[PDB]
Amino acid sequence: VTYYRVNNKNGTTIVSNCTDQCASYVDNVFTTQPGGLIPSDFSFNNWFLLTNSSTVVSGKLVTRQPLVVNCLWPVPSFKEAASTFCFEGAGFDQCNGAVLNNTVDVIRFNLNFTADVQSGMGATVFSLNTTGGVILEISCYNDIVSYSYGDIPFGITDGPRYCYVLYNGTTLKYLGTLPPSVKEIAISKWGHFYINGYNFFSTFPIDCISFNLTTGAFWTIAYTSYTEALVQVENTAIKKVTY
Amino acid sequence: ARYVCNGNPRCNKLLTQYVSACQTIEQALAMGARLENMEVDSMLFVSENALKLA
Amino acid sequence: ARYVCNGNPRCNKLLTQYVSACQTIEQALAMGARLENMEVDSMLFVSENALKLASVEAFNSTENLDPIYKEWPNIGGSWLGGLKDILPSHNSKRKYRSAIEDLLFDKVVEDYKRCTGGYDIADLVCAQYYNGIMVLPGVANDDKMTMYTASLAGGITLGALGGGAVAIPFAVAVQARLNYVALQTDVLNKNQQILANAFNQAIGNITQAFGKVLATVAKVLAKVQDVVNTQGQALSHLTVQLQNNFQAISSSISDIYNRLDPPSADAQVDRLITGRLTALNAFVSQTLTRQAEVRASRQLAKDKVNECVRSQSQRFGFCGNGTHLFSLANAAPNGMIFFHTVLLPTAYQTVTACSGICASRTFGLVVKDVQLTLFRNLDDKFYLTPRTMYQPRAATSSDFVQIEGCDVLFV
Amino acid sequence: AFGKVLATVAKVLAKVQDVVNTQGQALSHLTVQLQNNFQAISSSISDIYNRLDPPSADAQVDRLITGRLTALNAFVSQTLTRQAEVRASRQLAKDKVNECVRSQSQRFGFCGNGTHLFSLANAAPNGMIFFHTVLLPTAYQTVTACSGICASRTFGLVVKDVQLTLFRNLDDKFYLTPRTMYQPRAATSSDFVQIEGCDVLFVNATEIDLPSII
Amino acid sequence: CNSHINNIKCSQLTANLQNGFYPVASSEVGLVNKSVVLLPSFFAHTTVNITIDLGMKRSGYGQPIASPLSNITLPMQDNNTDVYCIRSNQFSIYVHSTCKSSLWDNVFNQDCTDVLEATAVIKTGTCPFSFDKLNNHLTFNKFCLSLSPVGANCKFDVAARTRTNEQVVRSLYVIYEEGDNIVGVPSSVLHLDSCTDYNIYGRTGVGVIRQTNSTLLSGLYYTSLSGDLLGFKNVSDGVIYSVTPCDVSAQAAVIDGAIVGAMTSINSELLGLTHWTTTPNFYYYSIYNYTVDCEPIITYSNIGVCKNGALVFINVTHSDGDVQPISTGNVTIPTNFTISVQVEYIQVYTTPVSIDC
């Protein structure tokens, strides 16, 4: 296999070579098709089925999932460590491929990591702005707490992490322990926070969401919406989608 | 699907988990009828010259 | 015991109370199979003298041919282009099977020694074995069924029962069959090459049709596969009943005892025992009905062999659609495949028939043999001919019966 | 063999008993369903009313009624299938009487393994027992068969009755014999048919045979 | 029960076996090692201690009586001690008790003795699990105990066991959801090429674990239609292990009240039979000196078994052949005859049954 990069954004199709990690780019970044559909040749790396069940579900199933992409923003680059996203007033200006002008139901974060590295990458905190305005924050700690925030690692962790919802910097709820590997974070408009497809935390509807990164954190951020689709799932990981 | 789920959009969704059961039911009946039609068609015939004076 | 209680020492004890239920289940299946084996064994037989010349290699040689037939280089030479795909072959995979048989078996699809090897992940058959479900061979297994059909085919060209294996040409055996259809009188114009060519081509297309996976071939493949699929589903249906909790906390016996203390765990198990015994009773009833259905089918198979393969039948339409010449048979999954070789007319001859003859004190003459048609030829002479094949015979006095009167239709 | 409780006798005893055992089990199975509580406090109707007041006792009984009616429906379905199976068997019994007992059949292998002579029949539980009396050969006679006769303007002669074998005897005369029993018959002219040609397998006729042959 | 023939008699509930084939286990096992495979995750263990203080007393007759006024103590969490929750990956739960007694009501300044003596036992009430089994590798999404009967699933019955009787004093309520986050532990080792009691990725059973070379498993484990474990993958190496039963069904051939031989798929001595041969589908063990020509007494399938254990196979009936319609050359016509009588049975009617609904 030989890897070429094609860019027709200025109206003329230009062809050049790619180095860096071309294989990773073809495994994570896709061009959005008209209507917001994901190309049939996309491998769905780190795209997990969103479920409320605690168990592992596999096989061919028809479900309502956020698989319609309103805008795909590849390899995002932020002005500062922190950034803000909104479900409503969001603006699409860096969409790869077709852009569909609609309301976003779910913001999906495809995290950048390598197997067996335990690199210094992660988020200090995720801040969820609910309807009334109550700011709830999610942060995870090296040990059990009994105002300092914590660390939510991306990829492989060196040990256990205890996740709490914060308020006034004072722990408000214990959510649980993170999985050995954090590959995807997905946040819904309706107040549901997912890790690797599992509903980790639920609250009141969210108007906006923001976070502060420690010190290219993401492969891509997809602004998506719910549709009915037939999906082939292996270990909560989507392998194929037929809309 | 119609027998079990009576056109109710919300029942048909639950029934997704049993698609293989429905396929077994529908295919079993279809195969039975298919085999019967073949051996029945083998038995039957006509003759135009005989029908003309029948 | 293994199906209901999965080797769990503590479940088997509870199952003691249901021993009479298990005995009923096991005995019912054993009796069904026993009766079947007896009537199947009655049907099957072999003949060593026929088997000796039943192969393709035997047919392709002169070694067994009776010296009186020096004009023939082999047995059925002109017919071998067809027979070679029907007769068993020595030089093949799986011992002695025919080309069509291999196609029929391999396009459709028991060793249990292998289930204990442990060098791979068990397949469906071993997975069933582990649950107490196993398939046994019966009397009509595939190898014995093959011998049966080979012996029948090899009988066609066996000249005598005195002993040894003295063969006659296939063409000679066929000509003998033609005489039963109609006495052959046209000896100066043999049509053996024509019939042999048509036969060889028909088999060519049949063998090809099976390999390709012809209305008759499509019908057979559908029916053969259906028999196989039905038995498969019957057992797959039974094994999945083991996943039914039957209102227990779990379907797994060892899981129940792993989680719950004996005084309560036994109650959970009692429900699973009752449920699983019920599933077995349903299985047995269903199985016995299928055996009854087959019994009726088997009688037809037996009648076909005796009236189409081993002899000439006078039953119109019984051995295929047309005028029956001969039949060959081979093995098939769970039964037999029959090849009915029939005559098909391509053109009809018109003759002017005479009801009878009025002769002179006057008297009538009618034909003694009612199967023959009396007609007058171009030379003004009377001829008789059977209605199944136009083989005209000069009429003589021994063919007629005197009667007192004459009809209006008499000549 | 019957008194002793012969492969044919063993087969019959097994089959006859099985028919009887099956009907027995069908009814024994039905009666034991009455012991099923069907989630009631008891399977006994009088026990329910003896222990429990009518407004609650009726509910316990309604479950037993539903259960027992279900058992009867299963019984009826099972019974009707057995009757259908017997119908097919009965047709065979009828054909056997008409073709083996009341008449001689021309169907090879139908009335026993061998050459059928006669059949007798008796009663049996739920049906009939047939005694097929057949002929069994103990020795075979070898003869040298003639395909036909070529006689002389030449012509062929073939045997009119295709079930007979033509052969020449030790006195050089022609005989005909059926292939089911060796009962040789002197051949005569009324037994032969004239044809235009001769095969290679035909025997050459002599003048001394022609007066009886043609 | 004490012998192989008597074990068959016990199984069948008979004191007199008939000539025939009886289903037996190829072997029996017990007293074997335990093997477990857990999801790697991380070690984080919590010890959970429940203390039950029983207030026993006495009646006029002397019938010892426990006091509903007894105290159950759960460890300290979130200051309140009325609801303790498990917030770790692994846990162990132990119950301990102290028995105190009184002559005067509610003083409890004296040890209980003799007939007053009691020990607390927690037994299954309405929960689909026993308290003492929570130390096995049971798995939960959540598990929390509560002395308050509010919004709680099932309850345990906490009873005082005395030398006279046993009675329930208090209930302990437990909140739980099924899942794989929290695992019970006694206070990831497997034993290969041995019969073992295993618990692998949430699947419990008894069998033999073997290391194999394949890529068949896509997930942690693969099961049969019946739900049984057929094999599993080690998360770290990708190596596949197969799982098979320690024993299989076998058929014991019994003649004249003794085991003559048996068929099995496992090439191992069974039922005291040491000699054997090999058949197309199974191994055959018997009393016969194997490293034949005899008349079988019992049969099944296409197999017969002789009194001396010899194994015989059944042949297909032979015949001379059929007489063909051939009139050329040397042919045979049956001449001498005798009579044979063949007997067959055909069902004509069913016995009609009338049922009064």
Ligand SMILES: *[C@@H]1O[C@H](CO)[C@@H](O[C@@H]2O[C@H](CO)[C@@H](O[C@@H]3O[C@H](CO[C@H]4O[C@H](CO)[C@@H](O)[C@H](O)[C@@H]4O)[C@@H](O)[C@H](O[C@H]4O[C@H](CO)[C@@H](O)[C@H](O)[C@@H]4O)[C@@H]3O)[C@H](O)[C@H]2NC(C)=O)[C@H](O)[C@H]1NC(C)=O
């Ligand atoms: C349908 O009906 C026909 C009858 O018309 C049955 O055919 C008969 O079957 C039997 C059983 O196989 C045949 O008998 C066998 O003959 C063999 C050859 O004959 C030798 O021995 C005789 C002795 O009288 C000599 O006259 C002859 O010249 C030969 O020397 C024997 O070798 C066989 O021996 C077997 O049995 C004996 C006794 O138990 C053993 O000691 C031997 O080791 C060996 O196992 C046997 O005697 C009989 O010849 C067949 N007759 C005909 C006309 O075919 C069909 O079987 C039946 N069909 C069905 C399905 O049942």
Ligand SMILES: *[C@@H]1O[C@H](CO)[C@@H](O[C@@H]2O[C@H](CO)[C@@H](O)[C@H](O)[C@H]2NC(C)=O)[C@H](O)[C@H]1NC(C)=O
């Ligand atoms: C991508 O890399 C290839 C080399 O693998 C470049 O190929 C060169 O093309 C120029 C003409 O444009 C030739 O003169 C060179 O000789 C080629 N190099 C080699 C090693 O053969 C190709 O140009 C690169 N793509 C772009 C857009 O620059």
Ligand SMILES: *[C@@H]1O[C@H](CO)[C@@H](O[C@@H]2O[C@H](CO)[C@@H](O)[C@H](O)[C@H]2NC(C)=O)[C@H](O)[C@H]1NC(C)=O
């Ligand atoms: C998990 O369960 C919650 C309910 O507790 C689901 O939330 C609903 O989401 C739909 C959008 O499809 C809204 O129309 C409903 O009003 C929401 N209900 C509530 C109470 O907020 C959530 O979608 C489920 N998530 C998954 C993956 O199944």
Ligand SMILES: *[C@@H]1O[C@H](CO)[C@@H](O[C@@H]2O[C@H](CO)[C@@H](O)[C@H](O)[C@H]2NC(C)=O)[C@H](O)[C@H]1NC(C)=O
């Ligand atoms: C994904 O993360 C990896 C690190 O895990 C990034 O790779 C590093 O990039 C920096 C900046 O260019 C280099 O100085 C390092 O040497 C690179 N490390 C390795 C191991 O190659 C990568 O750039 C990130 N990619 C995306 C798409 O965000």
Ligand SMILES: *[C@@H]1O[C@H](CO)[C@@H](O[C@@H]2O[C@H](CO)[C@@H](O)[C@H](O)[C@H]2NC(C)=O)[C@H](O)[C@H]1NC(C)=O
């Ligand atoms: C199927 O049968 C046809 C006969 O109708 C075969 O067609 C003949 O092919 C032979 C040569 O093998 C020619 O001699 C004939 O003239 C053809 N007759 C036709 C075309 O009607 C055909 O080859 C057979 N197919 C197979 C696979 O054997």
Ligand SMILES: *[C@@H]1O[C@H](CO)[C@@H](O[C@@H]2O[C@H](CO)[C@@H](O)[C@H](O)[C@H]2NC(C)=O)[C@H](O)[C@H]1NC(C)=O
């Ligand atoms: C049977 O087939 C033969 C051919 O093999 C037919 O004979 C032909 O008859 C036509 C007139 O109908 C002549 O023109 C041809 O020269 C003949 N060809 C020959 C003698 O081979 C014969 O007529 C056919 N029979 C019937 C009843 O149609």
Ligand SMILES: *[C@@H]1O[C@H](CO)[C@@H](O[C@@H]2O[C@H](CO)[C@@H](O)[C@H](O)[C@H]2NC(C)=O)[C@H](O)[C@H]1NC(C)=O
């Ligand atoms: C039919 O049975 C008779 C006996 O009843 C056989 O006749 C015997 O033939 C042998 C020679 O094969 C003579 O040695 C005996 O003296 C004859 N005994 C007689 C005349 O009773 C007769 O050969 C048998 N038929 C066949 C074909 O073997």
Ligand SMILES: *[C@@H]1O[C@H](CO)[C@@H](O[C@@H]2O[C@H](CO)[C@@H](O)[C@H](O)[C@H]2NC(C)=O)[C@H](O)[C@H]1NC(C)=O
């Ligand atoms: C699963 O595989 C891992 C290795 O990938 C096994 O753990 C290692 O076992 C070896 C024994 O030779 C030790 O030397 C290593 O220190 C262990 N750890 C590591 C990270 O290699 C583990 O035991 C296997 N589990 C099972 C149930 O077989």
Ligand SMILES: *[C@@H]1O[C@H](CO)[C@@H](O[C@@H]2O[C@H](CO)[C@@H](O)[C@H](O)[C@H]2NC(C)=O)[C@H](O)[C@H]1NC(C)=O
């Ligand atoms: C039919 O069988 C007889 C024997 O019963 C054959 O006659 C013998 O033939 C040999 C030569 O092979 C001579 O040596 C003998 O002297 C002949 N015996 C008698 C009594 O003639 C006869 O040839 C065979 N016929 C056929 C067509 O095979």
Ligand SMILES: *[C@@H]1O[C@H](CO)[C@@H](O)[C@H](O)[C@H]1NC(C)=O
């Ligand atoms: C697009 O980029 C190419 C390459 O730099 C350039 O040649 C072309 O003129 C650009 N198109 C426009 C509209 O500027």
Ligand SMILES: *[C@@H]1O[C@H](CO)[C@@H](O)[C@H](O)[C@H]1NC(C)=O
């Ligand atoms: C996140 O970044 C914003 C903007 O720089 C800053 O005001 C805020 O205090 C930061 N919060 C944390 C927890 O780092």
Ligand SMILES: *[C@@H]1O[C@H](CO)[C@@H](O)[C@H](O)[C@H]1NC(C)=O
């Ligand atoms: C949350 O959204 C409200 C919308 O009015 C805004 O006033 C408030 O500052 C936001 N808080 C954040 C972004 O933390």
Ligand SMILES: *[C@@H]1O[C@H](CO)[C@@H](O)[C@H](O)[C@H]1NC(C)=O
């Ligand atoms: C603490 O919480 C109260 C909620 O009533 C909020 O008004 C206050 O500003 C918070 N204190 C700090 C330092 O954020």
Ligand SMILES: *[C@@H]1O[C@H](CO)[C@@H](O)[C@H](O)[C@H]1NC(C)=O
């Ligand atoms: C018959 O033998 C010849 C060799 O003499 C061979 O070429 C031919 O293919 C064989 N025929 C068959 C049907 O095997």
Ligand SMILES: *[C@@H]1O[C@H](CO)[C@@H](O)[C@H](O)[C@H]1NC(C)=O
């Ligand atoms: C036969 O000839 C006689 C004498 O001419 C005639 O009367 C009779 O009708 C003829 N028969 C028929 C059937 O025409």
Ligand SMILES: *[C@@H]1O[C@H](CO)[C@@H](O)[C@H](O)[C@H]1NC(C)=O
């Ligand atoms: C019959 O005799 C003639 C004259 O000798 C001869 O040519 C012919 O071949 C003989 N027939 C047979 C079948 O041998």
